[PDB]
């Protein structure tokens, strides 16, 4: 199946664009990565950054995570990210997301080796 290190990418890397361009962003890459598949996800984050700038957060600042597990990376300098949420009228199968632009620290957990981000945690 699909590994984890995979399914990050999938859910929240697009180093194809710096920012979103759009209010349509979010509604058509929820869509294209198949994150809409079964249910609408509620929130989900993207960053515009080079995959190799990301997977270095794993040697940046350990910190802990959210729900506590000691697996987690803050990076040094701010990223590039788009912050997607769902609206008052999402509604499956026709799921709808509002598009927000940032410039943010992410945290994600790190594991394997390789030692690669599974998933993302916050952005600050």
């Given at each position: 199946?699909?590994t ?16 979103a ?16 598949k ?12 080079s995959?190799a ?7 940046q ?28 009228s ?12 940032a ?15 599974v998933?993302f945690?916050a952005?600050?």
């Amino acid at each position: 199946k699909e590994t984890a290190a995979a399914k990050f990418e999938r859910q929240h890397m697009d180093s194809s664009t710096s920012a979103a361009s759009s209010s349509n962003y979010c509604n058509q890459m929820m869509k294209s990565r198949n994150l809409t598949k079964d249910r609408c996800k509620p929130v989900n984050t993207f960053v515009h950054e080079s995959l190799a700038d990301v997977q270095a957060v794993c040697s940046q600042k350990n910190v802990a995570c959210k729900n506590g597990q000691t697996n987690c990376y803050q990076s040094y300098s701010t990223m590039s990210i788009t912050d997607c949420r769902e609206t008052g009228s999402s509604k499956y199968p026709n799921c709808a997301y509002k598009t927000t632009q940032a410039n943010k620290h992410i945290i994600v957990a790190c594991e394997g080796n390789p030692y690669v981000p599974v998933h993302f945690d916050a952005s600050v």
